[PDB]
Amino acid sequence: ETLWDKLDHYYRIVKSTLLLYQSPTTGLFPTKTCGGDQKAKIQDSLYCAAGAWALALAYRRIDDDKGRTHELEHSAIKCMRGILYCYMRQADKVQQFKQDPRPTTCLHSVFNVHTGDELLSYEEYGHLQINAVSLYLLYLVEMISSGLQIIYNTDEVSFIQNLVFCVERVYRVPDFGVWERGSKYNNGSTELHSSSVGLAKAALEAINGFNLFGNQGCSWSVIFVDLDAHNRNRQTLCSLLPRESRSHNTDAALLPCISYPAFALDDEVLFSQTLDKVVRKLKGKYGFKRFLRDGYRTSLEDPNRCYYKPAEIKLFDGIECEFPIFFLYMMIDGVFRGNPKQVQEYQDLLTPVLHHTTEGYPVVPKYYYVPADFVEYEKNNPGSQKRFPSNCGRDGKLFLWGQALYIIAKLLADELISPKDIDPVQRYVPLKDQRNVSMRFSNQGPLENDLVVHVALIAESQRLQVFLNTYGIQTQTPQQVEPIQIWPQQELVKAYLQLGINEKLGLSGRPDRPIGCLGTSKIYRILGKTVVCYPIIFDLSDFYMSQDVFLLIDDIKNALQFIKQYWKMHGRPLFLVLIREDNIRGSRFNPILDMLAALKKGIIGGVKVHVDRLQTLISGAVVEQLDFLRISQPDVNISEWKDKPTHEILQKLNDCSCLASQAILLGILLKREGPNFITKEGTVSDHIERVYRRAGSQKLWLAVRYGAAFTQKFSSSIAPHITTFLVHGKQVTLGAFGHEEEVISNPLSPRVIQNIIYYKCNTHDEREAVIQQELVIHIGWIISNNPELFSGMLKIRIGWIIHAMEYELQIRGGDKPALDLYQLSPSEVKQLLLDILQPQQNGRCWLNRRQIDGSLNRTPTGFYDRVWQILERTPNGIIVAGKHLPQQPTLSDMTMYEMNFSLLVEDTLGNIDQPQYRQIVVELLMVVSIVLERNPELEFQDKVDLDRLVKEAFNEFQKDQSRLKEIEKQDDMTSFYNTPPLGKRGTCSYLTKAVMNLLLE
């Protein structure tokens, strides 16, 4: 039998199964093959089109094809044109979502297939889904690279640009998930999904630097991408790779994100452990279940409640459905990985479960269900009973996605094609080939990091450069580089904003956002003129920490590490450094000399750096091109001077020279009269900015902080820090110690958080805004470079940290009055923050250590499993400080590693006023957990009262001191706090005595 017979068999299979139900009006396949359903999905039709394209490519190998490939190619093109037309029908939603990402403005994903219009409201489906758009873009670029023609005019290029800009911000907004249910509770909440972000990373990587018209194109067929978004996407993936979601330990949806459709996880070992875990935990006799405890279209369900009631999911376990389609995906992964043994075993497994038509055509049903007779018997022994086929397994109903994947699996299995043909963009590469790939691996090899970066020395003024030359320092004035130009970062921002404008539809282009160091590290050419920019850390900033040399040295070292670790583009990066004359300012001129001498030496903290003349470096280097533009103490107090008249405050402001008095008088004038008032020097805002800049020049930290609080200006980096804190798994609350606090559980827009923090600031204090900014940026930097330092802490509260550090400073002061924190330079505040955040050692009072640990809300490792296992072996429950935690709901709603149990136990434990009391409690809980797990014979008879135990332990400790040192009964247990938990007579001994006294009775 020649190839003609098998190819004709595949043709008749496709005609009888896939192409039979195509809609000629639109070209989109429907979700249901019977009953005249008007609902159509995006994934199914795209998969069918991909299968048809694969079959056409397979049949292309015959010169006498008789036009069969013609029909398949035009069917794929018609499907692509229909889906693009439907996407481009909705234009307002794209623009709205580009500015304010919300479910209301999300692009619709379900629409009537007869006329390409929406048929259902967004209040019943959500409609927010990005994996579909990413997969559509990936398949479209794949088909263009194959040799097909998909786009006609320039407007579609602008639409693709706007879609790329739209999907660049996927790493923050939560998604409803591939299964549309999202959380396992199915209550109406959105959670982050690793599969969507992985698909987005793959699509952004593929779309970079590609001609869209195919064979022909000069300057209007390219796509521009930002490396910063790609870096954030890869960071989010690497952080969230082990667990798909906070509420899902594992899911079956991970396979497509980490197999043929994506091919994104280039780490082998974590790929191996992930595949092993998913296979071990999701394997079934009839296929792969969606996830554990999945109540998805099972026997017990009823069609009257969209959202599941609490504790029903517990009853829903054990009766999960089986989807044999994933056997096909594993077959595909095996056949690309060159492991025939998996091919044979999986084909043998899928052989009996497959069904036949009247003519014997293969059938793959959707899901498998158990009859109502075996509802309880299957629970005792998993898999003894035999399930029953679904409705789409006998006749009249099919699953187009299923037969498409089946036929593509058979086409790959029978060797009629090769892996290269079906993947023309080399998405998958072997371990021996990953040597000189772009945007994935460096030229030095995967397990190597020895990059050399270039630096350019440019001065500002002739006086500064001659002064540096007198000491042997070589630097060049900006007037000697006339062929080259140096421009700030806002020029590139406005240039990028100019791009992506269309008049017929109405598009705002790329939003005005800051450009990262990686983007500015390149060299640009506009209007034929070379433009080079320096990092944002160098420009003038109103804030105060930019005036400290140690801050700049640490920041530039961090930037050098960042450029070293996250650079993969061909060619050495370019770094620009500018020295200012006011920086030397007399005595502080030594550290810059040391830093520049180290820079001239060649190595900066283990990083190799090369320095030479700028024109030499720019010559012989690749320059990025932008051709779009051508085509297109105080003596004044608040209370005493509050009631003074306006003329008196004006004259006092005029005749006073103290900075603090001037600032406070300006504040009184602003709060009483307003910002529009006119004073001796012009407007009130003008005086505020002028005195603020004067204080910044003179470096009065209290004055600059007060002026910055007046200016109501905020740093443009809070959002990355809050997003990274959320993605790590920690919690951050904004507020003041002893006052109201706001908890943030999901990412929010900058406007809302700014309004909340400014309202709190107006309520309580004056300089806490800038202090919180400084602490949050320092916390972000210390957690970014030293993540292990924050082990054990989950809720990061700025007020408790500032109180703890103030207490530590007061302790250090001793007899000397405690130094005010508002007058401290950034150097000592970062030093003291690192000191208090240290793991801490002995020598100091244990009460202070317990105070610091409790203020940080530190928890011991493995505490959460310990309290859960206590609860499993606590028939009644635990009451702490008036809070009740019944065992039935927590055992019937949650599981071992679920984070909701963590938040509930933390909420229960957070009512303790004294944090030292809290750490006494947590130590007692650790002790009781240990002593219980070491002996299973002894069990509790009723609920334990931790207050009772701690009080009797205090009584025993008091009796011990009374007998030993002859100390009378003293109120408060600070003496118990001072005693270390371990030693000759530690707190652990008293707690254990508590445990035995409670168990024995």
């Binding site: 034929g528 030479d612 030499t616 470096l617 010559s619 012989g620």
Partner: protein
Amino acid sequence: SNSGVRLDGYARLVQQTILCHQNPVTGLLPASYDQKDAWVRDNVYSILAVWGLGLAYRKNADRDEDKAKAYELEQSVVKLMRGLLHCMIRQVDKVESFKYSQSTKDSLHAKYNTKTCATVVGDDQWGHLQLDATSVYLLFLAQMTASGLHIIHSLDEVNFIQNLVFYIEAAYKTADFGIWERGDKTNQGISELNASSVGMAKAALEALDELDLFGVKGGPQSVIHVLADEVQHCQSILNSL
């Protein structure tokens, strides 16, 4: 654009004027008229027009055709440059002899030949002593290699250039025939010092202070080392006369 028209016209004029007698393989242009000779000074000076034209093309190329034009102009320049270098590197014995003592008999020939780069005259039929030609040659060599063309390939050429540096470093106390190859004012030529040669050599020695011949991808031994006292002596001699 107008600039394109002007550059095309200038290229046409240069092509019709000087490039028509480029004499490939050897790369040495004839020294005008029907003389069948190649004077080093004229060959060095006749490349500045092509050089400036190519640099004008390079910055505004932005197209395959203009990229190719700049490429071919630079390759013609390096051809002519290597053609000059070969004739001297073929004659290391004379420079080695000149390195000790000063005499006209042990001096480099001033008029090299066409194809096969041979000698045309002996040592008693012409004035074979012109420090200005070698100095200005090395000056343009330094300028071109600072621009970014690779001219030097083998490391032995570095040693030859270092030897030539010592060959020309004694120009402040060595009498030469002169730029006009006519000796002093009257004939029956007697060697006599002139300010032109010393002034030409001072900048040539200054240019090669640290300028490496391997570009940005050099090594520990890629820079020509020069002293400083000879430059000051040349400056003093020039100022005096």
